[PDB]
Amino acid sequence: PTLRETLGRLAPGTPLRDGLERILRGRTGALIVLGYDDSVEAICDGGFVLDVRYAPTRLRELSKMDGAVVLSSDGSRILRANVQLVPDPSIPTDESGTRHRSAERTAIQTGYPVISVSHSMSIVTVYVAGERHVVPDSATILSRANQTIATLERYKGRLDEVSRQLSTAEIEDFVTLRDVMTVVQRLEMVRRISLEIDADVVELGTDGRQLKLQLDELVGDNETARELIVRDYHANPDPPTAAQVAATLEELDSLSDSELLDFTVLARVFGYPSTAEAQDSAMSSRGYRAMAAIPRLQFAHVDLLVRSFGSLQNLLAASADDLQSVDGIGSMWARHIREGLSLLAE
Amino acid sequence: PTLRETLGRLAPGTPLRDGLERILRGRTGALIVLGYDDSVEAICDGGFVLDVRYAPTRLRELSKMDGAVVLSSDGSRILRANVQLVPDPSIPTDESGTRHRSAERTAIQTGYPVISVSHSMSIVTVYVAGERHVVPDSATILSRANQTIATLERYKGRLDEVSRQLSTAEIEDFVTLRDVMTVVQRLEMVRRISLEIDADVVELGTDGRQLKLQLDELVGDNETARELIVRDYHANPDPPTAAQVAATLEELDSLSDSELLDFTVLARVFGYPSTAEAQDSAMSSRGYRAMAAIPRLQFAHVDLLVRSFGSLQNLLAASADDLQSVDGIGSMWARHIREGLSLLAE
Amino acid sequence: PTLRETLGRLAPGTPLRDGLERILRGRTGALIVLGYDDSVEAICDGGFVLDVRYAPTRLRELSKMDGAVVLSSDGSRILRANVQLVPDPSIPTDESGTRHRSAERTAIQTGYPVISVSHSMSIVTVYVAGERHVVPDSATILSRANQTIATLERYKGRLDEVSRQLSTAEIEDFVTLRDVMTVVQRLEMVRRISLEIDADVVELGTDGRQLKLQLDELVGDNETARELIVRDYHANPDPPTAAQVAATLEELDSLSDSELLDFTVLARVFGYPSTAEAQDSAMSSRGYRAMAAIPRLQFAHVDLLVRSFGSLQNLLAASADDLQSVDGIGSMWARHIREGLSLLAE
Amino acid sequence: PTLRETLGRLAPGTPLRDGLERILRGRTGALIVLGYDDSVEAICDGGFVLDVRYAPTRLRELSKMDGAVVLSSDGSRILRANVQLVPDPSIPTDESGTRHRSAERTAIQTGYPVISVSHSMSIVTVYVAGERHVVPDSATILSRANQTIATLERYKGRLDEVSRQLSTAEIEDFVTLRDVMTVVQRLEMVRRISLEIDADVVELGTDGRQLKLQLDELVGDNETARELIVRDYHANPDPPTAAQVAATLEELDSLSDSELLDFTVLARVFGYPSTAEAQDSAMSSRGYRAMAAIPRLQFAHVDLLVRSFGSLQNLLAASADDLQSVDGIGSMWARHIREGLSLLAE
């Protein structure tokens, strides 16, 4: 199935890695296959059947019978052992060594994991989804995670300073395309780095029970800010809806970093002029990003206010009772809203 | 056992940190209990009795015994090593890792901090008073301090320009509540950030011997200015005494940011009408700010002059021998005071 | 060899550090010792005699041969191997470990550079001058140097602005004690930080071949600035001489920072009324400071002009040809000085 | 502390051997000094004084502290750990290596064994009594033990068939010195090889608990045969007394292979003319061996009858009453003696 689900099960703490480390410290080989179907049974021959509940020591001891062990897809039922796996000898494989050739060919024929641990060494190999992947030690994972994290707060500092510059320019509004789109591309690139580090966090699983904590405490409200900026900044006669936001996010994720750093591509994702003067073109915020800072506000009334106003300049020039004129808005609530708005203009 | 005393005890330069860094270079784990008592004895079982003076080499060598190194109360006497810990497991535990769980359980059992270093990773944790913390590398804390120092100079410059404007108003006295109170409003935050950075400075201890001098040069006379502004800018029948000043500053430190960003809450803090028009209310300064800059001036003379005058206008308009007629004021001493007042009139 | 000459030989690029690195990558012990006296032979035993030219591989192999290698005092010819460095047990040593205890006692008995690399780690150790210095990886050195560069460049900024203010004031000279020695305090601070970064670059050697560029670009003229300020400003009836200037320089260097931040001590080093009533005392500039800005001008001319004038205000009031009236001065040559000095007023 | 007592103490089953195997499985070093005298205390310095009860796990843990582990003289307490071994360097040595030279010097300075288990290696070394012994794997010990038990059993077969031939020639009243003392020739060398087997068995200890019973069932009665033959076949006026028999035993044991393989030397040990005619000479027998095979006999009665008769011919010529007429001999025993003698005469 999915590589970043079999690796997730292959995260430490899970019983599978308990068995794997038991095998590794026992200084012996292993050939573990997860799952059972018609094709797995059809290929595997010359092996016993156990039909017992998975335990950490069953795998460790059963690996010693000089053969492959076939499991249940949930890793619960050990229903085959000692078996030689004899897949189609026509499937192309590049490994050298009968153990690894069999592992790769079986993983190609049936998509289930075929984990191989070479004897006399400490190497764990995963053959999921037609990609070989040596299991690395936690030291290298943590080291590369540390470098990526450091570069991540570098990105965070840059993005935060650009965002605060945008906020300052907005609260005395004179806003062009360049600053907004630089904010957008910084947000997209920090999102990409966040996703990569999240994949690394999934790979760690539980040994590094701090990387996701640092991601939460550093990246923060990335997705909410992304949604707000997409809903606000979109060149359409009317503000986009949730479906349009999702479509724009999909388009942004589809384009690569080369298109991410290209201003024209980001312009045409929302839909902007492609001329060099578009970057010099100025526009006013719909207000979503600016007034999102006010707490205890529901999105329905936010959208209603945006529809009733249209631009952030209208809200800035709104009278004391102008907000009360909007449907569904009370007197004290609107008066309490202006208290936050008033301090922002300072 | 407060957190910000074990943090100081673990600061670089202290021999305990030397032992810790040697252990870190050893690529092996640690389990250090900075205290022994009857509860520790109940937990402790199956170990050696050493009673040797502390040495980073000795600590590094003992930390290879796969157990617990039980230092004395002050962390200067090794008492037990290779001691297995059997704390009560009924108490809640949220740590991920048997060693960390046992260490936290022991720290809950007795009021002694416990430090654990994971095997093959350079992490270090503190379990003081039930609080979980990770001691970070000098690079991260130095970067954080450098980042916050910029906001420190920004706050100091804002307070400086506010104070200069206030003094320019004073020489042609016309005082409103907002102008006379924004100085304290900035003083509170600058002192809060000063103490926040000083916590990091004392955490460094000796490694970051530049942040201490930076805070020395940047904070300046923040405390004296705060005390004098409390003495002067308070609408009370009589100038505040030492007890009154202490109570008011304690109230100022008690209030949170929600009680700080609003000048009106601060107005109730000093004691003022809660009406909005009170922001435009006027009052006569005691005169501390203008004449506090006179060189070779004792605070007792300042307080006596404030008590005998009660306003800055009387001091400014004081005649040549008006100050000399005040009891305890000599002839030459009185002349020098008026020299500053006449010069400051520009 | 001094401590900061052994560290220089142990700086990267040097052949000895190359051999140390080859040993470190070889993951094997090494006990390399430098020098050849009667005591080195009287302690070493159990080894061969070679007399072949030094190379990066000879020490590596003879260290792989599980013994201590002895080297010529210049580290150029190898004449022992395999030796067992056996000093007396009378010399105290708190290290735990036979190899390192032998290295420490060897260094104490014979003040020579003995290198004690431990296997299973990447640690390089030297026990010279009564202390052991763990040679650090380039990362930590670069980190601390980069941290120091920020403080030092802030210091150059403070010096330049304070000194420019003092020079502009001295154009219409009215001198106060605090104003005349704040410049000296800041100059001594920047000198001390320059020396500290010099120690860092000495221990760094050639991997960080950029901090020398930073210092050369930044500090520029500091020792000449100290010389000029002491020569121009030194209250004593006879003109200060080179010996007197140097003596004052090491007198300043002898002062502690606690002694540096007190104006009384800095005054009595130069020689001033130490009373608190001399803070407003003023004196005329001797002529070194302001007039030293003239390009293509020798120091002997400066000294003879000072002898002819003895002050700077009289130079300001000097005519255009009285400079020519000075011995050894022509007309057109003197016209250059007056034009430059006149432009110095603004 | 003999070599073949500490070798036995190191044999499997002994807790010391269990601790040694625990250390070996841990792939860590050990420098274990079996004993604690004031000289050892004068050599051991720089460590922890423990004085705890011995346990294999305690030894395994202490061996990780990278030093010397001094056990008590009987190997019951671990009373020093991580102590430095600084012996007298004036002691001559042939080893080359700090551990292997310091161990030998400590062994020479005080005769206690110094077991060294070099890390990452499976080798165990013993330095007892001034020679070096390497503790071997049990497989080689069993291999050599069986290889030599085979030649022992073939020696025993030749010995007892020659003894049967001697008995057959003995009951004819003709005696030749060569036939008499070739049995002693066989017996001495069989005793030597038996001592070799016993040394191998002591080295094994408990793993090879089959060689001991193999010895007990092959060597059979050897000391009794030796003492009986030396008491019977000796050229002296009267049969040797217990002290005389014992002295002849050590005289026989004193000679070496080159002298045992020579018939004349062994004859001279008995006491005989140097001529080869003595080999052809005929002597009377004391009858000890001939009638020693009779069951239910008392040594005192055998000695009394031999003294009263002197020769086996007198035993043959003795009547039923004559044996009973001898004091201390019963009537039913007298006929039984002849009954066995009559059977032996056939």
For B301-331, the DSSP string reads HHHHHHHHH-SHHHHHT--TTHHHHSTT--H
Q: Is C85 annotated as a binding residue?
A: yes
- Residues placed in the known binding site of D for ATP: 67, 85, 98-102
Query: C45 to chain D nearest CA, in Å?
Result: 9
Residue to mutate among B48, B52, B66, with most D CBs inside 10 A, is B48
Query: B52 to chain A nearest CA, in Å?
Result: 35
The beta-carbon contacts of D290-295 under 8 Å, at least 24 apart in sequence, are D290/D167, D290/D170, D290/D171, D290/D315, D290/D344, D291/D315, D291/D337, D291/D340, D291/D341, D291/D344, D292/D224, D292/D228, D293/D340, D293/D344, D294/D336, D294/D337, D294/D340, D294/D341, D294/D344, D295/D340
CA dist., res. A311 & res. A284, Å (int): 7
From edge to edge, which strands make up the β-sheet containing A124-126? A44-45, A80-85, A68-70, A30-33, A114-117, A124-126, A133-134
B 120-149 residues inside an 8 A Cβ radius of D: none
**C330's torsion region: left (phi>0), alpha (psi -120 to 50) or beta?**
beta
Please give the single-letter amino acid code of residue B269. V
Residue in chain C lying closest to B25 (CA): C121
- Nearest Cβ partner of B61 from C96, C147, C150? C96
Number of H helices, E strands in chain D: 18, 8
Residue in chain B lying closest to D78 (CA): B48
Q: Show residues of chain B in contact with A157, CB under 8 Å.
A: 147
Residue to mutate among B24, B210, B214, with most C CBs inside 10 A, is B210
Q: Would you call B259 exposed, middle or buried from its count of C-beta atoms within 10 A (0-12, 13-18, 19+)? A: middle
Q: Is C215 annotated as a binding residue?
A: no
Please give the single-letter amino acid code of residue A132. R
* Chains in contact with C, where contact requires at least 3 CB pairs less than 8 Å apart: B, D
Q: Would you call D104 exposed, middle or buried from its count of C-beta atoms within 10 A (0-12, 13-18, 19+)? A: buried
- B97 phi and psi angles, rounded to 5 deg: 140, 130
Query: Are the beta carbons of D82 and B61 separated by less than 8 Å?
Result: yes
Largest CA distance in chain A: 85
Residue ranges covered by each domain of chain D: 1-135, 136-288, 289-346
Query: Are the beta carbons of D64 and B62 separated by less than 8 Å?
Result: no
Q: Does C41 touch chain D (CB under 8 A)?
A: no
- Nearest Cβ partner of D86 from C67, C89, C97? C89
Residue A88, token pair as written in the block: 């189609």
* Chains in contact with B, where contact requires at least 3 CB pairs less than 8 Å apart: A, C, D
Q: Does D89 touch chain C (CB under 8 A)?
A: yes
Q: Does D96 touch chain C (CB under 8 A)?
A: yes
Q: What method was applied to determine this entry?
A: cryo-EM
Q: Report the interhelical angle of B177-204 vs B138-171 (nearest 10°).
A: 160
Identify the sign of the CA torsion D42, D48, D49, D54.
Answer: negative
Q: Does B66 touch chain D (CB under 8 A)?
A: yes
- Residues placed in the known binding site of A for ATP: 67, 85, 98-102
C-alpha pair distances (Å), A35 with each of A116, A203, C64, C104: 15, 21, 51, 61
Residue in chain B lying closest to C280 (CA): B295
Query: A136 to chain B nearest CA, in Å?
Result: 14
Query: Are the beta carbons of C94 and B210 separated by less than 8 Å?
Result: no
Identify the sign of the CA torsion C78, C82, C83, C89.
Answer: positive
C-alpha pair distances (Å), D275 with each of D260, D271, D281: 18, 12, 10
Of C309, C161, C178, which is closest to residue C232 (Cα–Cα)? C309
* D178-D179-D180-D182 Cα dihedral, nearest 10 degrees: 70
Contact indicator for C43, C86 with CB cutoff of 8 Å:
yes
CA dist., res. A144 & res. A150, Å (int): 10
Q: Do chains C and D touch (3 or more CB pairs under 8 A)?
A: yes
Resolution (A): 3.1
Query: Are the beta carbons of D45 and C89 separated by less than 8 Å?
Result: yes
CA dist., res. A183 & res. A196, Å (int): 20
Cβ contacts below 8 Å, chain B against chain D, sum to: 23
Q: Is C102 annotated as a binding residue?
A: yes
Query: D82 to chain B nearest CA, in Å?
Result: 9
Of A103, A93, A69, A98, which is closest to residue A83 (Cα–Cα)? A69
- Buried b / exposed e over C71-92, threshold 16 CB at 10 Å, is beeebeebebbbbbbbbeeeee
Query: Are the beta carbons of C147 and B61 separated by less than 8 Å?
Result: no
- D104 phi and psi angles, rounded to 5 deg: -65, -40
Contact indicator for D238, D246 with CB cutoff of 8 Å:
no
Q: Does B25 touch chain C (CB under 8 A)?
A: yes
Residues in chain C after which the chain is broken, C→N over 2.5 Å = none
Residue D273, token pair as written in the block: 């003319």
Residue A209, token pair as written in the block: 């029970």
Q: Does C45 touch chain D (CB under 8 A)?
A: yes
Q: Show residues of chain A in contact with B134, CB under 8 Å.
A: 210
Q: Show residues of chain C in contact with B60, CB under 8 Å.
A: 96
β-partners of residue B119 are: none
Q: Within a 10 A sphere around the Cβ of D9, how many other Cβ atoms?
A: 18
Task: Provide DSSP, A166-207.
Answer: HHHHHHTT--BHHHHHHHHHHHHHHHHHHHHHHHHHHHHTTT
**Placement of tokens 């012994």 in the chain:** D133
Query: Are the beta carbons of C147 and B27 separated by less than 8 Å?
Result: no
Residue to mutate among C93, C96, C117, C279, with most B CBs inside 10 A, is C96
**Placement of tokens 């503000």 in the chain:** A239
Contact indicator for D194, D152 with CB cutoff of 8 Å:
yes
Cβ contacts below 8 Å, chain C against chain D, sum to: 33
Task: Give start and end residues of each alpha helix (H) in chain C.
Answer: 3-9, 15-25, 38-43, 58-64, 98-109, 138-171, 177-204, 211-218, 223-232, 242-254, 257-260, 263-270, 288-291, 299-309, 313-316, 322-325, 331-344
Q: What is the DSSP letter of A121?
A: S
CA dist., res. C283 & res. C203, Å (int): 44
Residue in chain B lying closest to C96 (CA): B57
Q: Within a 10 A sphere around the Cβ of C18, how many other Cβ atoms?
A: 16
- Nearest Cβ partner of B57 from C94, C143, C151? C94
Q: Show residues of chain C in contact with B210, CB under 8 Å.
A: 147-148, 151
Residue A117, token pair as written in the block: 């641990």
Please give the single-letter amino acid code of residue B289. R
Residue in chain D lying closest to B59 (CA): D65
